[PDB]
Design a protein around this nucleic acid. Sequence first.
RNA 1: ACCCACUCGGCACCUUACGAGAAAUCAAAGUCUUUGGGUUCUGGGGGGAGUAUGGUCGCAAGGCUGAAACUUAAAGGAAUUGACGGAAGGGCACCACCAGGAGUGGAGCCUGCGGCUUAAUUUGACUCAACACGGGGAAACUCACCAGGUCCAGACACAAUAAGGAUUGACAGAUUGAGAGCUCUUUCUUGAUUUUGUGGGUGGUGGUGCAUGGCCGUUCUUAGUUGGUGGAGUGAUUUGUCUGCUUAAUUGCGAUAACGAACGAGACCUUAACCUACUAAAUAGUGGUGCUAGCAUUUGCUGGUUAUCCACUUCUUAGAGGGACUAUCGGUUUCAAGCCGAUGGAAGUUUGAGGCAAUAACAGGUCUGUGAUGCCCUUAGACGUUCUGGGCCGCACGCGCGCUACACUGACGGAGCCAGCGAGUCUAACCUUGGCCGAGAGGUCUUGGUAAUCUUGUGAAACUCCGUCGUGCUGGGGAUAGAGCAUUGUAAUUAUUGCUCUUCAACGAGGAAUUCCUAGUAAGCGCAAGUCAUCAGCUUGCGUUGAUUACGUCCCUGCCCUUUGUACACACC
Lengths: 64, 71
Amino acid sequence: QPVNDFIDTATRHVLMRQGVLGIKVKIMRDPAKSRTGPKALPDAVTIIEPKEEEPILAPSVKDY
Amino acid sequence: KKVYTTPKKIKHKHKKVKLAVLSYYKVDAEGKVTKLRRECSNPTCGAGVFLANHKDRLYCGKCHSVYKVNA
RNA sequence: ACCCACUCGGCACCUUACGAGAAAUCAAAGUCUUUGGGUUCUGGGGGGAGUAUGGUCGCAAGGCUGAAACUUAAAGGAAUUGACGGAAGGGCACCACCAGGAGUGGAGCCUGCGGCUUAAUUUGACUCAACACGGGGAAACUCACCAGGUCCAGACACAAUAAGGAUUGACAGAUUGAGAGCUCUUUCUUGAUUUUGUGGGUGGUGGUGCAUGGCCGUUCUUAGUUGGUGGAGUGAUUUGUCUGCUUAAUUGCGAUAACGAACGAGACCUUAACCUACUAAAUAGUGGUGCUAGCAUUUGCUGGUUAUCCACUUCUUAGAGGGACUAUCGGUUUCAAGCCGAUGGAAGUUUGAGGCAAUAACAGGUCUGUGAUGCCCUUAGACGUUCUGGGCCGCACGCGCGCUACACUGACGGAGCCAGCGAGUCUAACCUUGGCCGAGAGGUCUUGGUAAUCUUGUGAAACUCCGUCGUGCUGGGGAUAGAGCAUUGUAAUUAUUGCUCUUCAACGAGGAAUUCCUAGUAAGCGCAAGUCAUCAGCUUGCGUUGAUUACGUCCCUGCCCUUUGUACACACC
Ligand SMILES: [Mg+2]
Ligand SMILES: [Mg+2]
Ligand SMILES: [Mg+2]
Ligand SMILES: [Mg+2]
Ligand SMILES: [Mg+2]
Ligand SMILES: [Mg+2]
Ligand SMILES: [Mg+2]
Ligand SMILES: [Mg+2]
Ligand SMILES: [Mg+2]
Ligand SMILES: [Mg+2]
Ligand SMILES: [Mg+2]
Ligand SMILES: [Mg+2]
Ligand SMILES: [Mg+2]
Ligand SMILES: [Mg+2]
Ligand SMILES: [Mg+2]
Ligand SMILES: [Mg+2]
Ligand SMILES: [Mg+2]
Ligand SMILES: [Mg+2]
Ligand SMILES: [Mg+2]
Ligand SMILES: [Mg+2]
Ligand SMILES: [Mg+2]
Ligand SMILES: [Mg+2]
Ligand SMILES: [Mg+2]
Ligand SMILES: [Mg+2]
Ligand SMILES: [Mg+2]
Ligand SMILES: [Mg+2]
Ligand SMILES: [Zn+2]
């Protein structure tokens, strides 16, 4: 499906003196810009980066 | 392929004759002009057009074919 | 005789490489451009050729010595990647077997192919990967073929003819299959649109698919491709990408001069399964209520009523979510990836079935899909086109896909009586309910539907029940043929199709061989759609009834992978 989604293909027939040539063009668009559709490949698996903690600290409690 | 055959005799064409024509008309000694060959009473053939004289047969050629007036 | 240590001198092997080399490799092939221990011998591109000639030795065969002319741009070495093998080792698979199912191969017919025949029987394609294929079911059309008849739709440029008329058309007759003015007779008509010529176009189901594009099929039911940093090598390259294990998978685990990634696989997408949770619905449906029929009557049971109202969303529809991750437990295993069993679960075989699908190869098929196309051919007595008629169907016979059958798990006759995927008419005649008529086929009058609204609950068929028949080519089987009725169409003859009576063939389970298939599958059974005016024995799908037997292997066959050989690289054609 991402093919449907992200690649755009066109074949044109250039008619030259000696015969004709077939031109095929493929363009793959950046998924991260998709504006209106999946923002990535189905493949894509990002893990959010954890936060270096400064734990310890014996109990205590705030009052408001 | 094969090429050529024929029991001879190739069909021709048409010519549409010649004729230095429209002498048919008679003008007297200065100079009354009388029409030879009657003209056609069809409202699509304003009386300039004439009728050919065959046998029985008078014929409007301007009517590309049509109508068979006969005297 | 044996064991240990040492030491001369041998035949060898192992590991390394400071070092050498074009490399393969080498304790010499090292101590060489930082070039000298002593010495002998041989080579100077490839052929011509160890040939000619002379000498010499030999019994001979022949040995030693040993040229040139001429010809030629490479011959050659080592290694690398491919490609191929009628070498070796592993694997993978119902287009392979195993266990079986259902058959085809035998028969009648249908249908494609060859062959023959023919005026013509248009043509492409011939192992899987040609032969119910070209969506190829051809009565005209299609159509390309054959017998014949018209027309130019021959752009444009120059030239010529020529307004005293360049050219156009025709009635009747002749003619012709033809009510074609094709041609001719005849004599009007037309008015610069044409005609003639050359040049140039143009069309062409003409050729070339071995000139091409595009598309498609095949290898492939396969698992392969590539770069970053590091390691190896002067280099092309290699390692990564690997013994093993595991997987449908270069899928992973693991091993590890590699580490970490990308394409392909997976992911993704579509469809089938699960939601009494969500949002709803007179184009879907339930319960209640009225109005109402029948049977009982004791409240009951079974129906009618596109709105008589009320409520709901379980069944139907389709939006949004949710769900499964081989989960829990256990066995097995390098307790690794995984595989196996049990439980739970709508669902645990990639959940089932599909879509999409890398790099690369083929002189695979298609110029007969294209106003895609190069080149060649042809172009007015056309290979353009159209009209009439025939032909693709022609039948000693070979081959392939099929359909129907050989009956009693059946045929026939009454009766029960249940799907799913679909499709339908505007400037038109498509899908057709209902009523009459008709034995049937059909006919006729109306009708609903541009559709979840009507056809249609598509009341489909196998199937189920009660009967008749009773093993007899029988009432199994329905070829062939006669006679009649209708439908489509301008047209049905060589019989489009449908109905009816009659005729009642082979076929008594099919030799050698051979196809397909593992679960809602095989097989049986029908339906809708494509085609379609009319014609399905074909296909694409659909649901209905619903098994037996594997859940393995490398024996056959096909392929893939390593190893290995190569003088191949246009790559064993
Ligand atoms: Mg090699
Ligand atoms: Mg078997
Ligand atoms: Mg058998
Ligand atoms: Mg014709
Ligand atoms: Mg010309
Ligand atoms: Mg010419
Ligand atoms: Mg053409
Ligand atoms: Mg080709
Ligand atoms: Mg091609
Ligand atoms: Mg050919
Ligand atoms: Mg399979
Ligand atoms: Mg290096
Ligand atoms: Mg490899
Ligand atoms: Mg619901
Ligand atoms: Mg269970
Ligand atoms: Mg070829
Ligand atoms: Mg083509
Ligand atoms: Mg045919
Ligand atoms: Mg076939
Ligand atoms: Mg019956
Ligand atoms: Mg009658
Ligand atoms: Mg109406
Ligand atoms: Mg009988
Ligand atoms: Mg019968
Ligand atoms: Mg049909
Ligand atoms: Mg067909
Ligand atoms: Zn007139």
